[PDB]
């Protein structure tokens, strides 16, 4: 069809079989880089806006405010532009020029915060802006907004179901907000009724899901796997649908993403390397020899040109 605006064009991302990972083609990847603003977050950018419209929290002339300049910030920026909303994004002044320019190109009102305060400063500035005129501004809150996992339940999950003819046995997904693994798992287990294995992936450097489920001290840590490992259990992570948690280290995530490019011709981001490293480990267990493993690849390589990936 013809999409009325770019937000409606989200999803329908392809599945590609891996040749150099898994065993006898049991690993398949879903390429979320193929989206209106080139990441998985495009889906949630669209649906959080759409849900806010439907429930009347977002109306003509209201302005979107947030403190993300990662994938969600970019997603919200294209959606705001596509649907005629003003948007302010707060970010620490030490963020890259490439990111400032991208966000400015998408028509965002960028508010740079104190380098010394990091993300906390940007989040406070955003919260402050909203507090100043609550009726003018709306903050969509990706970590708790149910419209996040809902879009994955309505689109991402059903796409996996349909493109595999229901043969999917395992879903492997890195956890940032938890929305992807939550929505996809609820779709396949509840709407389609199939008892798959849902595998959350997190950094070995910040393995808070692992620690939580073991009843151990929760000790977040720094890592390089952008987009995952938030260091807390987000509200949009439904632990009741998680079967297994795999930890992956930053270096192996990076090396794996490099292999995806050089050996498969897949321009994957860092967290995609992490998800595949986790999937490859399960795929080489005799228990998953005859199991179809589907892995979410959240983003695309060129967004990482200035990073350790290259």
């Amino acid at each position: 069809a013809i999409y009325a605006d770019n937000s409606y064009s989200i999803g329908n991302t392809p599945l590609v079989r891996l040749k150099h990972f898994g065993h006898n083609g049991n690993v398949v990847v879903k390429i979320e880089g193929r989206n209106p603003s080139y990441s998985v977050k495009c889906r949630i950018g669209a649906n959080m806006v759409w849900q806010a419209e439907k429930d009347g929290t977002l109306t003509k002339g209201k302005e979107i405010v947030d403190a993300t300049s990662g994938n969600t910030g970019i997603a919200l920026a294209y959606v705001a532009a596509a649907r005629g909303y003003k948007i302010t994004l707060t970010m620490p002044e030490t963020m890259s020029l490439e990111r400032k320019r991208l966000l400015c190109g998408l028509g965002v009102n960028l508010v740079l915060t104190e380098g010394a305060k990091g993300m906390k400063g940007a989040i406070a500035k955003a919260e402050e802006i909203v507090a100043s005129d609550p009726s003018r501004y709306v903050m969509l809150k990706q970590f708790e907004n149910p419209a996040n996992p809902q879009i994955h339940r309505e689109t991402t999950g059903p796409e996996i179901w349909k493109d595999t003819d229901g043969k999917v046995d395992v879903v492997v997904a890195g956890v940032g907000t938890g929305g992807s693994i939550t929505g996809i798992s609820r779709a396949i287990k509840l709407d389609f009724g199939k008892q798959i294995t849902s595998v959350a992936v997190e950094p070995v450097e910040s393995p808070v899901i692992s620690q939580t489920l073991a009843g151990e001290e929760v000790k977040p840590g720094p890592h390089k796997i952008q987009g995952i490992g938030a260091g807390f259990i987000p509200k949009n992570l439904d632990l009741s649908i998680i079967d297994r948690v795999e930890t992956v280290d930053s270096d192996t995530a990076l090396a794996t993403a490099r292999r995806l490019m050089a050996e498969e011709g897949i321009l994957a981001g860092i967290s995609s390397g992490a998800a595949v490293a986790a999937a490859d480990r399960l795929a080489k267990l005799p228990e998953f020899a005859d199991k179809l493993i589907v892995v979410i690849l959240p983003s695309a390589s060129e967004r990482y040109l200035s990073t350790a990936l290259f």
Binding site: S69, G70, T72, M91, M119, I123, P222, G227, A230, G231
Partner: peptide, 4 residues
């Protein structure tokens, strides 16, 4: 790490 919260910049997602």
């Amino acid at each position: 790490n919260w910049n997602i």
